[PDB]
Amino acid sequence: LNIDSIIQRLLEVRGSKPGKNVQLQENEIRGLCLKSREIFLSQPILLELEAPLKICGDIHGQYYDLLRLFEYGGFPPESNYLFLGDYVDRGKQSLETICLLLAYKIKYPENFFLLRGNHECASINRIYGFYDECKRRYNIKLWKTFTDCFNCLPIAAIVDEKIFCCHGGLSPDLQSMEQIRRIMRPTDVPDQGLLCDLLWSDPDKDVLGWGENDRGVSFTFGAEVVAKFLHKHDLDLICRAHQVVEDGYEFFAKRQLVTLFSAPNYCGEFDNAGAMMSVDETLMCSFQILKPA
């Protein structure tokens, strides 16, 4: 598996009009799954990360915007990266997106990190685009190979013991960080429970504690839950994705939580910028915005 040749090909459309596809061989994509899966399994499911790094929210198959984000943040390995999930579905080029991210994981396994989002889930990406994309450009056998890779993704990360990172949000079940570590991989995303909430829950200023989530899955949680959580674990900030935010980032509960969304002009349906959170070695966090004209 020539990782360098794969990266070179995926990065070849950096100077091309948007819309150009990169079609790796089916065997190379399978190799990207099998070797990244191996690296995910070898690394903790709750990542213990060190700044500086840049943190990115949903990409959702918008490959040329991913390249634009790297154009700003710095292509690996000029900067360290943590992505919060949702690499596939909704966009037109989920295949190029996840292959570049997995290739970057294999290439810099100690400087490039990918969390699991709710769309790295066979039940979800079956209906929201990625299955259909695998099927017309390659085949269903490849989609199932991706599912076995996604089942091994980590679900949370803590940076400098101060920034708690996951795709969705908190869980009423999360009492000890040990609980996340005990989760065994490969695993699917259950319809309820700890792992479900970490990929699916949302903050809500109108809820006092834990509340209904009208996504039909998981919970919403209030500002008090955030504050109690940060004091109990001695953290300073929750960093999550999972929701479209107009400015690419949005604070919640007196800046104790931030939502990142990194796909500008999402689906051609929304009016949003994309944002990364750049965290320096002093944990001073800045938001680099990718804004469309």
Next chain:
Amino acid sequence: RRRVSFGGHLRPELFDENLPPNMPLKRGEAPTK
């Protein structure tokens, strides 16, 4: 003190959806320690 802070607003990378990722309109401001 090892603690989260937030920097000032940064000028964003302005892009044209029809231009290559190689050709940004405005270089977004970089963060400085």
